[PDB]
Amino acid sequence: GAMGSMERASLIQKAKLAEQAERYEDMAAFMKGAVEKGEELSCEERNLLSVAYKNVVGGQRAAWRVLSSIEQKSNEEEKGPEVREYREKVETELQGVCDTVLGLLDSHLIKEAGDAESRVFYLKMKGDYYRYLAEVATGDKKRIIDSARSAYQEAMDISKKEMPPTNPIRLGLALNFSVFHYEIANSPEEAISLAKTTFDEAMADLHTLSEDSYKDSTLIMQLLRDNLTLWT
Amino acid sequence: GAMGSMERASLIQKAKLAEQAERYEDMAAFMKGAVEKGEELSCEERNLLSVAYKNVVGGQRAAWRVLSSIEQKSNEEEKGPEVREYREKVETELQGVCDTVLGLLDSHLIKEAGDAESRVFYLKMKGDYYRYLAEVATGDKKRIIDSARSAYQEAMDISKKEMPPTNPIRLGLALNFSVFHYEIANSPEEAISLAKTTFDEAMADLHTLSEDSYKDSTLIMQLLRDNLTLWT
Amino acid sequence: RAHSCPASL
Amino acid sequence: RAHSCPASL
Ligand SMILES: *C[C@H](C*)C(=O)OCC
Ligand SMILES: *C[C@H](C*)C(=O)OCC
Ligand SMILES: [Cl-]
Ligand SMILES: [Cl-]
Ligand SMILES: [Cl-]
Ligand SMILES: [Cl-]
Ligand SMILES: [Cl-]
Ligand SMILES: [Cl-]
Ligand SMILES: [Mg+2]
Ligand SMILES: [Mg+2]
Numbered sequence A, B: 001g002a003m004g005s006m007e008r009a010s011l012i013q014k015a016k017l018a019e020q021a022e023r024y025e026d027m028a029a030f031m032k033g034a035v036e037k038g039e040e041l042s043c044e045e046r047n048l049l050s051v052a053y054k055n056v057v058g059g060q061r062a063a064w065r066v067l068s069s070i071e072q073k074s075n076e077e078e079k080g081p082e083v084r085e086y087r088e089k090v091e092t093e094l095q096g097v098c099d100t101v102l103g104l105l106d107s108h109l110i111k112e113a114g115d116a117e118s119r120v121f122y123l124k125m126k127g128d129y130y131r132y133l134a135e136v137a138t139g140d141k142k143r144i145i146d147s148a149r150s151a152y153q154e155a156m157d158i159s160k161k162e163m164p165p166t167n168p169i170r171l172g173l174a175l176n177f178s179v180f181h182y183e184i185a186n187s188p189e190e191a192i193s194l195a196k197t198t199f200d201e202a203m204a205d206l207h208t209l210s211e212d213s214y215k216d217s218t219l220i221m222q223l224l225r226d227n228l229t230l231w232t
Numbered sequence C, D: 001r002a003h004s005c006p007a008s009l
Helices: A008-020 A024-035 A043-073 A082-112 A116-136 A141-162 A168-183 A188-203 A211-231 B008-020 B024-035 B043-073 B082-112 B116-136 B141-162 B168-183 B188-203 B211-231
Strands: none
Touching: A008 A024, A008 A043, A008 B043, A008 B082, A024 A043, A024 A082, A043 A082, A043 A116, A043 B008, A082 A116, A082 B008, A116 A141, A116 A168, A141 A168, A168 A188, A168 A211, A188 A211, B008 B024, B008 B043, B024 B043, B024 B082, B043 B082, B043 B116, B082 B116, B116 B141, B116 B168, B141 B168, B168 B188, B168 B211, B188 B211
16 A cells, blocks of 8 residues: 555655654554565664564554463353454454564565675564564464574574674664573573673673763663563 | 444453453444444443543544644745645544544434433533544534534533532533633633532532542542643 | 543543 | 563664
8 A cells, every 4th residue: 555656755754753653553554665665774764664563563462461361360250252252363463463574574675685784683573573473372383483593593693793792783682582582482591691691792892882882782781681680 | 344243242341351451443343343233332331432432532633743743843844745644644544533433423322312321421422522523623613613512512401400510421521621612612711610610519519429439529620620720 | 731531431 | 571672773
């Protein structure tokens, strides 16, 4: 597509307006539109894409969890299939949104990404969207988990080789990969180890950052530490 | 409709689940479904309807205001028609939602409402949805404003005759009618007067309420007073 | 600006 | 529970 007749620059402009208006579904459709124009995305453009879909999927995941626990509490009076039906409805929409993002990545963001920064970005996105599928998978599950692991690992290899330890996407990648280990892959020890090594390596590289870079890196470093406080 | 094949009681049950999951668009479709079954709504059922649509329209109104002020700030560098296009898109959706509610009221909630409590409820809802149309109307506007005034006034006449001054819907009706006077009809003096008389009459009737009724009435009385503090 | 009646319902 | 990377972007 419905965005096929709007100018690329117009879609981007409207995505920024949808962001300011907190209209993330709109924002997500504009950015999908923008991607399907077939030109590679700038740094700013990637951020808008990611913000849009994370907000849409964040609302869905939160609804799922509410409903999924109402459902588990009902298997411990017979109420009917309504809870399950609605939980499946929400689940199905969630899966459609992950499938949309994973389709954009496969057609053709990942293969056209030649620079480390863009390539890491997209492989991290791939990891995160398989991780969200994995959170709801029951049947399938093992394949989805391996697809997540595989994307995250590839991104980690590139980021280790090509980016300084304080790079915010490197830190955010590692934070998300360690949440994968802990919550999805049943590997607390791997989660803790990764979070610790990532924090320590960033700490020892801070002296190279300007004041602005310093602010950015330390914000996500704090989230690694918050997690470590919970896990240890 | 898409809800035509689901049981009335199932739609209600799922509306309560959508409420808990903060899925208000879903909630709104379930309740529309429930209304179109053609049976009158209970007190609880009316509340769910109202909560669902107020949440949907509240998000839209807030987006509109953000965008409408970006638009006014751009008439004071030439950016293109994107701001206007998107503001019209949001506006159009808003109008579709008000038109949906006003259609449910006309077919056939209002005419089947014989008791004061249900009748006041629906006429207040009618007032509020014309008021929201009026907020965006430019061309039309005078007719919309009179439709709002007319619904609110009819509700006030019934509530004055049929309900005690501390009844929460009577208080909420008056609060909303006075916001109408102040923000829509350009009548600050009418807004202040109505808020004052409503507060005073409730105050002098509190001694009849139980502890629970007392809590409910005083909560919206506080909102009248907040408004009066701003306006005077 | 003035508040109308919220949620509460 | 553990927090993943938010918004920030
Ligand atoms: C994905 C995550 C939030 C990230 O790396 O953000 C960079 C600031
Ligand atoms: C419409 C308004 C919020 C109302 O009367 O609520 C009753 C508690
Ligand atoms: Cl949205
Ligand atoms: Cl359903
Ligand atoms: Cl891969
Ligand atoms: Cl919603
Ligand atoms: Cl538009
Ligand atoms: Cl009327
Ligand atoms: Mg029992
Ligand atoms: Mg200039």
